[PDB]
Amino acid sequence: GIDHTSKQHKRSGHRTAPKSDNVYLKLLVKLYTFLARRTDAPFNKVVLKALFLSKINRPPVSVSRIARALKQEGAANKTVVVVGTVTDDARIFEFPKTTVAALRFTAGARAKIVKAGGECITLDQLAVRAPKGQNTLILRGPRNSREAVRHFGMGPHKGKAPRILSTGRKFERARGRRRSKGFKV
Amino acid sequence: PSRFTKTRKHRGHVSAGKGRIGKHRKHPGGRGMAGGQHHHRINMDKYHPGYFGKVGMRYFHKQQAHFWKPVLNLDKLWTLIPEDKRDQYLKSASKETAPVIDTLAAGYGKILGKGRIPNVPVIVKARFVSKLAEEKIRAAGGVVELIA
Amino acid sequence: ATDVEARAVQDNGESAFRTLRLARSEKKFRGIREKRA
Amino acid sequence: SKNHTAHNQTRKAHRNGIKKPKTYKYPSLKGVDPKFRRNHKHALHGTAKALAAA
Amino acid sequence: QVWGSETVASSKVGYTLPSHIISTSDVTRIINSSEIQSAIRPAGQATQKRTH
Amino acid sequence: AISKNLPILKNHFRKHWQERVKVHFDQAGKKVSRRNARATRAAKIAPRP
Amino acid sequence: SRPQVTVHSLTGEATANALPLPAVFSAPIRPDIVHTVFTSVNKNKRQAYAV
RNA sequence: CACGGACCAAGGAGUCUAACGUCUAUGCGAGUGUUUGGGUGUAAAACCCAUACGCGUAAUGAAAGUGAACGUAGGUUGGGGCCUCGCAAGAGGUGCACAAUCGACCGAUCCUGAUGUCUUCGGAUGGAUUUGAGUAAGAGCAUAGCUGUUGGGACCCGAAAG
């Protein structure tokens, strides 16, 4: 045998295809494996790997996250690319004129964009507009803003939440939470 | 789907998944939250601190109907107007016809002050009001009129 | 019907937070006025 | 040896490696003395004010 | 008038027919376009010869 | 056994709960049996609502 | 707009008036949830059994 | 030179459920869940639906209660991608997610006590090596699956007893 430096036969921990059985998503991977292998542009490798991402790693990109991203210096005429869902927002009031490319728009977001002069295209009419990724701006949504991330790492003095079912002054406030009762963690 | 469970992959292997040295037995450690401060103590001191004690006064016969006050922020305030009408007041922005927004009929017991509203005069009817959520209304030419 | 759609503005000088704050303490010091009387 | 050996413990420590603590730029200021820490708050403020007008 | 359309809305309350993830289904017809084919490096050797 | 980082659960199944469980397979049958005994009642009282 | 389908007689000959294809016939034909929604709606007519 | 096994057939042991943790798929998306019920039916199917309610969108405090923008929702350092320049190396511009750090804002705690004052109410303002399961352009709800948890006969068989 050999003196094995590192572990043998280890899968690289990245998925190479979606877990889903969506046929209308499997055709988008048949489009972007062609692009990312036969185009030297690095935009297509990004959208290829982003189509495999699970729903937890693919958070919704609200329509204010988009409208903020065009307030960058010299980025109004870009086309925004979101490889998740694009949801509406009733907290913004003026929205610019841009074309957004996305998997799934909601009903409120698709109505808001086309009202404001923009348009909504899917990720296959983007490839005829930008095969190399001309003037795109890949936005992403917040990942650590879930419910399940407030509980990761719960130990003493960490600042994380407890996994709890019902709150109130009777549930998990007494000992270890104040110096009156015992100690304070 | 029992054909997908791991009992089906465990036929043949003695001690089906549960080890041979320490077997699978009926309740080692007690039943339930037994031993919370005797032997499972350093679980409850790390993962659920705040257990094992008594804090606060008591409320005999608490009714949750008194403590009904669902909040609303200012950034969601124009949603209470219907969408085919809410833009009409945004375009015209006329002070002699400020649109009445009733928060209580929509089901809210307080209007709070998170967010910025457009500078359109509206009048808002609400049971309870925070100091910023009136300050940002009256700066917009608005009126808070209390209700009930 | 509640208050009808889109009436006019009569902004008076007093505020609604000051009213709710004063009416609360007027409830809270109901009886100590009679002890002071 | 039914009482506290340390045999096999060095094997187990070196399987997942003995990790260095990931030194970052801008380390924390939770232990530094509060007199310096209060004035460093106002020092960075007027610096950004002067670079606002630049 | 049951499932709605783009002009007639549905007789089911709050319902619009689901929308596509991808606009067309012949992916090779969008491969063989003007914009894709004029923006790719050239092909070669479906199976390549065994050197050495 | 208190085991891992999990919620503290209240499950009130320490009594003889298997004697008293009322599964509603009747949900389909009682809807027919109330739509029957309404139209029986509606024809019994003639015109009245 | 939509493709025009042909209305057939009761005897077989194609009657002249044509019908526009509706909007449901261009809905996404996704056989991965038709599989999932079938195998939990095919369970909705079961009867209980026990010993 | 430990225990079980004379041989053969058939039977024979991690199941189901209530409530949940992580992960994954799907639907919709600041919403979501039709099915307690009503309508309908080719009849325990399917199909349609009004009010409420559940969870979520707001936290904090024992409680009375208060209740989230100084700033193109901030400053810095990293940051994929995109853009500009050059044949190109490289240089500059913008920098989503995320990771460090310094602030701001809401609540509690401690302090400061301005107009006015029912003559002690009111709590503006400015603070602090304090504090929170918080804010800072929402991310959830529902259904399904493996694995894990707790109560249940609970992987099957077994006490001396009560």
UniProtKB/Swiss-Prot annotation, chain A:
GO biological process, one term: cytoplasmic translation
GO CC term (a single one): cytosolic large ribosomal subunit
Covalent cross-link (Glycyl lysine isopeptide (Lys-Gly) (interchain with G-Cter in ubiquitin)), residues: K115
Modification sites for N6,N6,N6-trimethyllysine: K49
Cellular localization per UniProt: Cytoplasm
Pfam families in UniProt: Ribosomal_L18
A Gene Ontology molecular function term of the record: structural constituent of ribosome
InterPro entries: Ribosomal_eL18 (IPR000039), Ribosomal_eL18/eL18-A/B/_CS (IPR021132), Ribosomal_uL15/eL18 (IPR021131), Ribosomal_uL15/eL18_sf (IPR036227)
Major location category of this protein: cytoplasm
Alphabetical keyword list: Cytoplasm, Isopeptide bond, Methylation, Ribonucleoprotein, Ribosomal protein, Ubl conjugation
Function: Component of the ribosome, a large ribonucleoprotein complex responsible for the synthesis of proteins in the cell. The small ribosomal subunit (SSU) binds messenger RNAs (mRNAs) and translates the encoded message by selecting cognate aminoacyl-transfer RNA (tRNA) molecules. The large subunit (LSU) contains the ribosomal catalytic site termed the peptidyl transferase center (PTC), which catalyzes the formation of peptide bonds, thereby polymerizing the amino acids delivered by tRNAs into a polypeptide chain.
Family in the record: Belongs to the eukaryotic ribosomal protein eL18 family.
Note: There are 2 genes for eL18 in yeast.
UniProt name for this protein: Large ribosomal subunit protein eL18A
Organism listed in the record: Saccharomyces cerevisiae (strain ATCC 204508 / S288c) (Baker's yeast)
From Swiss-Prot, chain C:
Protein localization: Cytoplasm
Source superkingdom: Eukaryota
Residue positions, PTM Phosphothreonine: T2
Miscellaneous comment in the UniProt entry for this protein: Present with 133000 molecules/cell in log phase SD medium. There are 2 genes for eL13 in yeast.
Oligomeric and partner information: Component of the large ribosomal subunit (LSU). Mature yeast ribosomes consist of a small (40S) and a large (60S) subunit. The 40S small subunit contains 1 molecule of ribosomal RNA (18S rRNA) and 33 different proteins (encoded by 57 genes). The large 60S subunit contains 3 rRNA molecules (25S, 5.8S and 5S rRNA) and 46 different proteins (encoded by 81 genes).
Similarity section: Belongs to the eukaryotic ribosomal protein eL13 family.
Cited function: Component of the ribosome, a large ribonucleoprotein complex responsible for the synthesis of proteins in the cell. The small ribosomal subunit (SSU) binds messenger RNAs (mRNAs) and translates the encoded message by selecting cognate aminoacyl-transfer RNA (tRNA) molecules. The large subunit (LSU) contains the ribosomal catalytic site termed the peptidyl transferase center (PTC), which catalyzes the formation of peptide bonds, thereby polymerizing the amino acids delivered by tRNAs into a polypeptide chain.
Record-given protein name: Large ribosomal subunit protein eL13A
Organism of provenance: Saccharomyces cerevisiae (strain ATCC 204508 / S288c)
Lineage: Eukaryota, Fungi, Dikarya, Ascomycota, Saccharomycotina
Swiss-Prot record, chain D:
Any single Pfam family the record assigns to this protein: Ribosomal_L29e
Disulfide bonds: none
Subcellular location field: Cytoplasm
Cellular component aspect of the GO annotation: cytoplasm; cytosol; cytosolic large ribosomal subunit
Biased composition (Basic residues): 1-23
GO molecular function terms noted in the UniProt entry: structural constituent of ribosome
Keywords, alphabetical: Cytoplasm, Isopeptide bond, Ribonucleoprotein, Ribosomal protein, Ubl conjugation
GO annotation terms (biological process): cytoplasmic translation
InterPro entries the record matches: Ribosomal_eL29
Chaperone as UniProt keyword: no
Subunit: Component of the large ribosomal subunit (LSU). Mature yeast ribosomes consist of a small (40S) and a large (60S) subunit. The 40S small subunit contains 1 molecule of ribosomal RNA (18S rRNA) and 33 different proteins (encoded by 57 genes). The large 60S subunit contains 3 rRNA molecules (25S, 5.8S and 5S rRNA) and 46 different proteins (encoded by 81 genes).
Further comment found in the protein's record: Present with 51100 molecules/cell in log phase SD medium.
Function recorded in the entry: Component of the ribosome, a large ribonucleoprotein complex responsible for the synthesis of proteins in the cell. The small ribosomal subunit (SSU) binds messenger RNAs (mRNAs) and translates the encoded message by selecting cognate aminoacyl-transfer RNA (tRNA) molecules. The large subunit (LSU) contains the ribosomal catalytic site termed the peptidyl transferase center (PTC), which catalyzes the formation of peptide bonds, thereby polymerizing the amino acids delivered by tRNAs into a polypeptide chain.
Similarity field: Belongs to the eukaryotic ribosomal protein eL29 family.
Gene that this polypeptide is encoded by: RPL29
Swiss-Prot record, chain E:
Superkingdom assignment: Eukaryota
Post-translational modifications: N-terminally acetylated by acetyltransferase NatA.
Subcellular location(s) of the protein: Cytoplasm; Nucleus
Subunit structure: Component of the large ribosomal subunit (LSU). Mature yeast ribosomes consist of a small (40S) and a large (60S) subunit. The 40S small subunit contains 1 molecule of ribosomal RNA (18S rRNA) and 33 different proteins (encoded by 57 genes). The large 60S subunit contains 3 rRNA molecules (25S, 5.8S and 5S rRNA) and 46 different proteins (encoded by 81 genes). uL4 is associated with the polypeptide exit tunnel. uL4 interacts with its chaperone ACL4 and the nuclear import receptor KAP104.
Family: Belongs to the universal ribosomal protein uL4 family.
Domain writeup: The eukaryote-specific C-terminal extension harbors a nuclear import signal and delivers the ACL4-uL4/RPL4 complex to the pre-ribosome, triggering uL4 release from ACL4 and incorporation into the 60S ribosomal subunit.
Note: There are 2 genes for uL4 in yeast.
Entry protein name: Large ribosomal subunit protein uL4A
Organism: Saccharomyces cerevisiae (strain ATCC 204508 / S288c) (Baker's yeast)
Underlying gene: RPL4A
Residues shown, of full length: 260 to 311 of 362
